[PDB]
Nucleic acid binder design. Structure first.
Lengths: 258, 187, 142, 124
RNA sequence: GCCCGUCGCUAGUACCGAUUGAAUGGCUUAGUGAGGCCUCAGGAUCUGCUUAGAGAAGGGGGCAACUCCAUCUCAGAGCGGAGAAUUUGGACAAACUUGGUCAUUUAGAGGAACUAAAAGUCGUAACAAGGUUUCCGUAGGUGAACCUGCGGAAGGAUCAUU
RNA sequence: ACCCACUCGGCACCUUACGAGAAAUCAAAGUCUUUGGGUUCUGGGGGGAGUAUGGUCGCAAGGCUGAAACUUAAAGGAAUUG
RNA sequence: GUCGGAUUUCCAACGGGGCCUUUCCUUCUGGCUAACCUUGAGCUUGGCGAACCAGGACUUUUACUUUGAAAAAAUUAGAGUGUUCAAAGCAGGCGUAUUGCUCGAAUAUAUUAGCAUGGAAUAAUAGAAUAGGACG
RNA sequence: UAUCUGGUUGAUCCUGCCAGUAGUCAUAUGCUUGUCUCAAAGAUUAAGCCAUGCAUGUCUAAGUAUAAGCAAUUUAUACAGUGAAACUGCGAAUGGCUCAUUAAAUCAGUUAUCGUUUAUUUGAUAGUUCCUUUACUACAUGGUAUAACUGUGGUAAUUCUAGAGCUAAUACAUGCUUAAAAUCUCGACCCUUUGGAAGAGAUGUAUUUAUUAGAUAAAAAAUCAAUGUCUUCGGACUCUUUGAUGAUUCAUAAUAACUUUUCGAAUCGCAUGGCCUUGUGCUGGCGAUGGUUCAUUCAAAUUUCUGCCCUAUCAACUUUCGAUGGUAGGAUAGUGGCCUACCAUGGUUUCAACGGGUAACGGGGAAUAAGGGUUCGAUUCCGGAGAGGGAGCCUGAGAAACGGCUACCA
RNA sequence: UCUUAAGGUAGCCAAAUGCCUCGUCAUCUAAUUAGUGACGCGCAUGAAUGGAUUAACGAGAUUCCCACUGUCCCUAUCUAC
């Protein structure tokens, strides 16, 4: 390779970005950031082909350098800034916040909500360990680390970050009967009230997740992300509620209520 | 251009691999240390990602730890006497990891007299009570006592002079010292 | 091999030390570990005199990755053996199988005594040598 | 480099070129449905073969399969939208047995002539 | 009637072939062996160092033989120190001769092998019991097909004897 | 020793064979387009040609292995008509 | 009984799960005090364990079945969509002609090895032989 | 769209090929120069050679200014406009091209790092140094030339330079300014003894030790080497710390020491409104530069399990001292015969090793499709190799880099 | 057809045997009456007056190549008698 990869082409970019194969040969490559290369949505493409607010790369970059938008409470004037799942980006113009959530079909859906949901967000703990000077800490999916966590937080948990302070207001653990969000694989964007788990000592645990339609499926432990307790959510569910309806029923429901 | 890959190496079946790739910067190797005694010349060599390596040459003084007494002092190496890898190393008097050397140990002797204060061979009240409390534990072994009387402790330098630039080591205790002195006596 | 201290160097587990100044019970100190994945450390490894720094029970190697099973075919090489895995390859055109055997060398701890014909399970570890990449974890041929 | 742009063929030359029956029948149909060339019947037969093969590989699968139901419903919806088949027949026999003549006697070129606002297919 | 083989004519193809010849010959227990790199060295040049030995009254001085204090300037030498030029041992290692088949044959004199041969010369070898039944294995001889001697076969000219 | 019956095992054939095969013909050459009991060896139009630069065995004669260039639209099998 | 389909009393073919037939689905014990010996006035608050999990042995080898990671994305199969059709592409919309949203961008073992639970017919493979045998 | 037909004979039935037929995101060629549409395009032979011109440079409110440039200066007696050149920082290791080499080598799927990566990362900094020290000593905070410039010269000459003199840091050996608690090494009181409060001081972050906490299966009574908070020295003695996966010597914290010393704004813009103990003192908010640290990320590196074409006209292959393994060392960012010192004859193989050929880069994939298949994949995306053939290297986080260098060779 | 007893078979050859002859072709060299290979109407080869071949051997006779050298270009100098 002789070095790191600095370019990305269309048809070689992840599917959920929804880039047309014409009108160019290269894709907006996200540089180092809080989220993975594949499981993230760059700000430029997000502004371009999801809101249609801007129609040019030059106009998008000018918007970014004029400090008219900000991410997670920070301006972050990066022309290809990557913002992935559970990312909050508020807009001072009309003060509308967009949460980058996953739709039922498996693409980066955008949810427009108000200032309270802009302030409060959710994160998934990746690992919990002890740093230098006997300081314990955690790792989140977006890198939003909080120092000195409460000792109950273990791996595969979820926390609420106020985006302003460094204190975890709410924490939700991992057990049977919890509202979850599968982020990975073919079930991208499904809520299925986790039932049980097969550990399979040695790694690669499996979790049985069943939607309200009693559609039960399985997923890797690395893909499930608990988002709240049964009933009420911690964050607003996207349109479709993550059901993944059968093909005949979905098609005739589109035909009826088109 | 010291290579480190297995591509130049013949396969497990005895076949000779063809030249697939030109050797890269990654799998490079460098010349050994061959650290001598006296007049330290530590050379810094840049490695991948920075991480300056310290190639020790002509090392003078090293830090040695007494495992039994729980102390470590900086003493001068008299010279290497045994090396399990190569006798040529002993002959040239070079310093490598896990090498059996002799040291002055006069820091160690002074620390022993300050700690226990027990007459060997053959003054405040606080010092008296402290020596009495630390007493009844000066029974290390006859071999160690005789070596201290001779004035040159047996040590194993077990650091990496070619990586860190220091010949840190530990004093030979018990079975280790017995085995190594047995090898020294055996032909 | 026959004796613990045959080599001109001294064989010991690193960073474990027994004080010769003190005289308590169980004077010598040896360190073991659980290999993981439900494999039991045998009494020979627990209270043996060997060191075998490259063993997965008292040495400084770790077992993680793949787990294989095979019958050993040679033992004349020291402190390690080669197991034989007689799988079968399927080809689609003729819709049947063929016997293909793969010989993979595996390190064996002195905790196990292995002869030809023994069925042995091995676990993947870090590259131990030029050819050896697996470590013997259990033998089931008495 | 430029991303690829796909292209496809639409007509199939028949396996044997000289049939005194096939050539004659295709000449009758081209003349009586106003078709300037033979590649047009070739491509219409290509589409007919495509839809017939889709129907065949749909029918080869067992009943009540959701994939079968969806594919059959979509094919029936498209065929009703184009209108070559009566909208009160769901036995799929007509769509599988659809012939080139029946397919061609529904496209707009025959429709204008039969409605009489052109008085000739060539004039249209 | 079909038909076989030498021999003559033409053309093409491949093979053998003296010539110890000419496609990474990949590596010699090989020898030379640049160049870079690590290194056993005297560090030829340099910045800040002690005015003590030099011409000095002075600021302090019983302005009568002694001093913190640099300057227009040179001394008998010790550090913070890259290190050039060079140089000793190495370890990589370009490129010049060599016990190796090739995955073209070349220039190959010559050596009547083969298929096409054109309406060729010499005799019928086979096809009928083809006028000596044919054919196979082996051996020998002769212009040519062939002939003969031995073992067999019927794909024979005998499924058949009392 | 012979005859009359039953055999077990091995050498042969004519029913317009319902079986198979192009046909001669076949108790197997049947149980093979209604195609699968288990295996080994051999062939892919006729020549060149059983001819190899080669490799092995043989004292030799020769044996085993064994092409290609090139050429050809036929070569051949089984009846049926003189 | 309601054509762009559904039963609360069922003669039947059935994917299937437990009951006992020398056969406890294979365990010595607990977390939520577990579908039940327990029980003022027809609503039954500790004996027989597993519906979510651990300390103690075998989860003994191989060839199939739904899944998951996912078999990159393209490219093929290919829902929807006036590029005027079609190749294509994921485009494309106006009623309160001046303050909405999106129908979408799919359900397809895509030379096929490796991991996880229930299914063990088929073909091998080892269990107790001049008992180093199982039970305490 | 699961199809055939012509050709041996006077004639017939046959195995059998030669043809005919239909396709090619398969080419070339000959005849046609009429029109919307994106557009394949020197790959086959020659990864053969290149004349020419281009393809890598770079700025903001926020690194250094004065080509002897521009005009307002009116807030500057030091400026916050423009600021070409040059220094510093970063990039140039991306991209684009080709397929030469390469047959378990790449590559595909799937793994491992508890065997290692990390410019700008990135989420934030880290009250620990006034080292002959309660006073060599600036912290309202140090020193020099290397550049452009003022002129001088060298050859036909090169993105050539010798020069004498001015000037800057994210430059250098330096360097320090900000508390405060607790523990630890010694110590003027006892012709004794369950005491240290004064003092000399050490305890941030890299390398070696060695241990403690780095513990859960499971509970009943005597003992001692000496009393340890304290009822009545019959002794109640408990609250005493204890983090995930299956697993590590794991991430960690401490203990005398090793550091030859790498370090914790001796950088700059933008807002500057409060109080007087008058200093421009005390204070007031944001923005590119950093850390010897991790809080995953873009990246590299080896690595596990299976799978690759034709050949026996290739049955044995693997070594002066690597040829499989063991111990130790060296080197590497670490694993490892990767390289050295010391044993056996160890490893592969008819289940095809080894050797040879490839008109071989490997995949997604391309052409017909009843099925099973047979060919192709240089080429629009991924991975690998190269940038005349070889090698060896500096800078750099990352190159065996060639639109970087060194040396030898068409 | 003449003709003998038979008319030189297998082999080999400008051979130590070929007059013409320094035969002809190829190769070896810059150049070759030399050497080797090949061709044979062979003045006048040829089969125990033995034919052909042949590993090893040879103070046997020719050719070429490498190394090496005063054989030579082109001679010079030294020692002993």
């Amino acid at each position: 390779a002789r070095g790191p990869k600095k370019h990305l082409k269309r048809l070689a970019a992840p599917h959920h970005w929804l880039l047309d194969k014409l009108s160019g040969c290269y894709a907006p490559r996200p540089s180092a950031g809080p989220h993975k290369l594949r499981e993230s949505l760059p700000l430029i493409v997000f502004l371009r082909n999801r809101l249609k607010y801007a129609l040019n790369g030059r106009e998008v970059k000018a918007i970014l350098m004029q400090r008219h938008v900000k991410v997670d409470g920070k301006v972050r004037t990066d022309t290809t800034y990557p913002a992935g799942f559970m990312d909050v980006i508020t807009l001072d113009a009309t003060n509308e916040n967009f949460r980058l959530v996953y739709d039922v079909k498996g693409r980066f859906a955008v949810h427009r909500i108000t200032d309270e949901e802009a302030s409060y967000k959710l994160g998934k703990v990746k690992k919990v360990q002890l740093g230098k000077k006997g300081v314990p800490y955690v790792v989140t999916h977006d890198g939003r680390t909080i120092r000195y966590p409460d000792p109950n937080i273990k791996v595969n948990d979820t926390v609420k970050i106020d985006l302003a302070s460094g204190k975890i207001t709410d924490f939700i653990k991992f057990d049977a009967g919890k509202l979850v969000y599968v982020t990975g694989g073919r079930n991208l964007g499904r809520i299925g009230t986790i039932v049980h788990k097969e550990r399979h000592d040695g790694g690669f645990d499996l979790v049985h997740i069943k939607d309200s339609l009693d559609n039960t499926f399985v997923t890797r432990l690395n893909n499930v992300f608990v988002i709240g307790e049964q009933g009420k959510p911690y964050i607003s569910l996207p349109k479709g509620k993550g059901i993944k309806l059968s093909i005949a029923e979905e098609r005739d429901r589109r035909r009826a209520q088109q | 251009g010291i290579s480190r890959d297995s591509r130049h190496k013949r396969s497990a079946t005895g076949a000779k691999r063809a030249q697939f790739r030109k050797k890269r910067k990654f799998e490079l190797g460098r010349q050994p240390a061959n650290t001598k005694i006296g007049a330290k010349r530590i050379h810094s060599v840049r490695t991948r990602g920075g991480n300056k390596k310290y190639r020790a040459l002509r090392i003078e003084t090293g830090n040695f730890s007494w495992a039994s007494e729980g102390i470590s002092k900086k003493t001068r190496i008299a010279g290497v006497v045994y090396h399990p890898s190569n006798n040529e190393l002993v002959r040239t008097n070079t310093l490598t990891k896990a090498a059996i050397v002799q040291i002055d140990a006069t820091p160690f002797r002074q620390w022993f007299e300050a700690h226990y204060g027990q007459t060997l061979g053959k003054k405040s009240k606080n010092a008296e009570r402290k020596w009495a409390a630390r007493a009844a534990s000066a029974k290390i072994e006859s071999s160690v006592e005789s070596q201290f009387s001779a004035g040159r402790l047996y040590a194993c330098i077990s650091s990496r002079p070619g990586q860190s630039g220091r010949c840190d080591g530990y004093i030979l205790e018990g079975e280790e010292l017995a085995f190594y002195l047995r090898r020294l006596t055996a032909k | 091999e026959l004796t613990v201290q045959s080599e001109r160097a001294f064989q010991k587990q690193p960073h474990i030390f027994n004080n010769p100044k003190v005289k308590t019970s169980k004077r010598t100190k040896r360190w073991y570990k659980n290999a993981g994945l439900g494999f039991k450390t045998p009494k020979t490894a627990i209270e043996g005199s060997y060191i075998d720094k490259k063993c997965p029970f008292t040495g400084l190697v770790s077992i993680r990755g793949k787990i294989l099973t095979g019958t050993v075919v040679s033992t004349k090489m020291h402190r390690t053996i080669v197991i034989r895995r007689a799988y079968l390859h399927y080809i689609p055109k003729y819709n049947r199988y063929e016997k293909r055997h793969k010989n993979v060398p595996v390190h064996v701890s002195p905790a196990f005594r292995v002869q030809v014909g023994d069925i042995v399970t091995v676990g993947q570890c870090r590259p131990i040598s030029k050819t050896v990449r697996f470590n013997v974890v259990k033998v089931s041929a008495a | 480099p430029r991303a690829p742009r796909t292209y496809s063929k639409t007509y199939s030359t028949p396996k044997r070129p000289y049939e005194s029956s096939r050539l004659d029948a295709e000449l009758k149909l081209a003349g009586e449905f106003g078709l300037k060339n033979k590649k047009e019947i070739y491509r219409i037969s290509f589409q007919l073969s495509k839809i017939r093969r889709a129907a065949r590989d749909l029918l080869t699968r067992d009943e009540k399969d959701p994939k079968r139901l969806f594919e059959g419903n979509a094919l029936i919806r498209r065929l009703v939208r184009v209108g070559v088949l009566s909208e009160d027949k769901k036995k799929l026999d007509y769509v599988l047995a659809l012939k080139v003549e029946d397919f061609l006697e529904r496209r707009l070129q025959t429709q204008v002539y039969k409605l009489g606002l052109a008085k000739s297919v060539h004039h249209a």
